[PDB]
Amino acid sequence: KRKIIYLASPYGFSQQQKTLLLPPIVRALEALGIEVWEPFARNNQIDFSQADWAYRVAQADLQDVKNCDGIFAVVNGTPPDEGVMVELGMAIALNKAIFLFRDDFRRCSDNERYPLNLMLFAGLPEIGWENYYYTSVDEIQSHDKALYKWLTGM
Amino acid sequence: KRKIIYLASPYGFSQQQKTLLLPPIVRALEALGIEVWEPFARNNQIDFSQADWAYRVAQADLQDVKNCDGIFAVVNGTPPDEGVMVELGMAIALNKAIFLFRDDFRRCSDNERYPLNLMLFAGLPEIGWENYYYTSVDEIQSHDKALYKWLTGM
Amino acid sequence: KRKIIYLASPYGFSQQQKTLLLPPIVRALEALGIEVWEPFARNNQIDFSQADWAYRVAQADLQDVKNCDGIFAVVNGTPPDEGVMVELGMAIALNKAIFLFRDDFRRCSDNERYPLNLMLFAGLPEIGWENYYYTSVDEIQSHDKALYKWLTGM
Amino acid sequence: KRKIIYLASPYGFSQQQKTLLLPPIVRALEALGIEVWEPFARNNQIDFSQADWAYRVAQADLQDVKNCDGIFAVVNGTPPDEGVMVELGMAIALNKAIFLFRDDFRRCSDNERYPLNLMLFAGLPEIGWENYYYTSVDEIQSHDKALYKWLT
Ligand SMILES: O=c1[nH]cnc2c(C[N@@H+]3C[C@H](CO)[C@@H](O)C3)c[nH]c12
Ligand SMILES: O=c1[nH]cnc2c(C[N@@H+]3C[C@H](CO)[C@@H](O)C3)c[nH]c12
Ligand SMILES: O=c1[nH]cnc2c(C[N@@H+]3C[C@H](CO)[C@@H](O)C3)c[nH]c12
Ligand SMILES: O=c1[nH]cnc2c(C[N@@H+]3C[C@H](CO)[C@@H](O)C3)c[nH]c12
């Protein structure tokens, strides 16, 4: 069975970001052999004319985080997206694999060790957390970083 | 034994907000008979002179969310605080009781049903979610709202 | 005639913050002999039941920034409030006196020199901008900081 | 002389956004015959190892807003970017033309008339401000919207 990554991001909210930013990240993950669950694409069939669609998206996304093997969370922005953060907290509590992506060079932090709010790293090991922290789309395929180690059992 | 509420908020980051905003919320919860776990206060014996303090705070807060009975999440701001959101996601995944506080009247939402990102409500029931959503400090004591129903088994 | 300070803040958006955080700041400024224009208070005779109230607040605040002598901008939050930032940009372009207030210890910055986005400091001097930068309510009345020196022409 | 638009955005902060999002917007503006001043590109010839680079960037952007004819502010995100907002306030106070771009469908507002904080619209007319408000890159070239009309 392929490992399943839930690709959490705010990029579905902007028409241009949805069209241009997500496909390259999806493709980078798929090139490692990962099955990618991207929520904006997976919720295509919900009936958005009905008033309960927001509840139905919430529950579908909760189920996807429960059923994934890891989360790949796009945590660009100041601050990172609140929905992505909820999904990240779910992933941490459910002991999913955690991978963080930030190619935004601004620092937005409450501490000196981590580049973001310390809670985002609570599900990563004390040592080597930066191996799970990706700062460019080109880095996703790196054999030295945590996605590759995960797939190769190292 | 008293129910334990984890009071998640960004109010510890600002000197004035920590001093003035949190004690009234703490007192409102305590007046219901709740034991309040406030993380900015509870992390007062971490050695902040040591470089790992941020990791030890992260783990301490994760353990507190695992051990609470419910979270009372202050979700003021545009957007809500990313650390609060991680803790909220943890609470949802761990089937804790979920209560939300927002006396910020700005609307910051991706949908028409809820006043915030739909993910924040994923741990609340489809019907009656607003019973868990508090919009003033004065409302916390309300016998018609979910904190009181929780405590009285209704 | 008293110097006029426009007190820009997001604190009017939260019921508790409006009641508890703003009066102490207003009072500290007034103790210096300043006439304080606080926008949430100053627009309390607008009819908020009428559809044009938002345009009338915008124009009232535009006029107040044009007519003030200085702006005292509360730039707490990650990021600072977007309305406060528009008013700050107006003040810079109109050669008003500029004073910044941040008692939030988090860093949210795109550079190493300043704790915030470099644009917020465009109306401050290259050297000694920190004299215009207030990090606690108790510091506002300091005779060593720029607000007091400005009022006394020293 | 070609009208000058200052293209304010936070897209320069993210490597992928700077590479992918900004060139299409620049090209849409330039297709209208506009001279586009994009701050992340224009700041290139600043020495970023001299300690004062942040101050120099700030002053250079201030001057570009003073010397543009209009601002085209990308106000995506929740909230819109604080540096874009400072530049927008400068443009309002300096009586520059104002155009806003938001293809982010989330609402982030303190009022019922506008989809964002009311201050962002203080430099736009009470009626017809929507004609200055662009919600897709495709819309930038519309002859029914305010940017094209401003060119005549
Ligand atoms: O409109 C939507 N479509 C699909 N999913 C979401 C969500 C849920 N998550 C949260 C996060 C964006 O907040 C992204 O991973 C999708 C919120 N709004 C929508
Ligand atoms: O500096 C800190 N002190 C204590 N806790 C936190 C946390 C953890 N949570 C997250 C949330 C603020 O982000 C609040 O509930 C405390 C992040 N930074 C700090
Ligand atoms: O409800 C309101 N009342 C008064 N002013 C504003 C503004 C304008 N400014 C902007 C800034 C808050 O965004 C504060 O200085 C007031 C936005 N909303 C309101
Ligand atoms: O690193 C930077 N490069 C170029 N410009 C800016 C600015 C000035 N403005 C502000 C706004 C981004 O905050 C965008 O229009 C550029 C701040 N930081 C930088």
Residue numbers in the entry:
A (entry chain C), B (entry chain A), C (entry chain B): 2 to 155
D (entry chain D): 2 to 153
Paper text:
Here, we characterize the structure and function of a thermophilic dNDT, the protein from Chroococcidiopsis thermalis (CtNDT). Nucleoside 2′-deoxyribosyltransferase (dNDT) enzymes catalyze transglycosylation via a covalent 2′-deoxyribosylated enzyme intermediate with retention of configuration, having applications in the biocatalytic synthesis of 2′-deoxynucleoside analogues in a single step. The reaction catalyzed by dNDT proceeds via a ping-pong mechanism, with the formation of a 2′-deoxyribosyl-enzyme intermediate covalently linked to an active-site glutamate.13 Transglycosylation occurs in a stereospecific manner, preserving the anomeric carbon in the β configuration in the newly formed 2′-deoxyribonucleoside. As with other NDT enzymes, the active site of CtNDT is formed by residues from two monomers, and therefore, it is only fully formed in the dimer/tetramer.
Structures were obtained with the two potential transition-state analogues ImmH and DADmeH. ΔG was −5.60 ± 0.08 for ImmH and −11.05 ± 0.42 kcal mol–1 for DADmeH; therefore, binding is determined by an enthalpic contribution. In the structure of bound DADmeH, however, E88 is 2.5 Å from N1′ in the sugar (analogous to C1′ in the substrate), 2.9 Å from Y7, and 3.5 Å from D62. Therefore, in the complex with DADmeH, E88 is closer to the bond that needs to be broken, D111 is closer to the nucleobase leaving group, and D62 is farther from interactions with the nucleobase when compared to an enzyme–substrate complex and also farther from the 3′-OH in comparison to the 2′-deoxyribosyl intermediate.
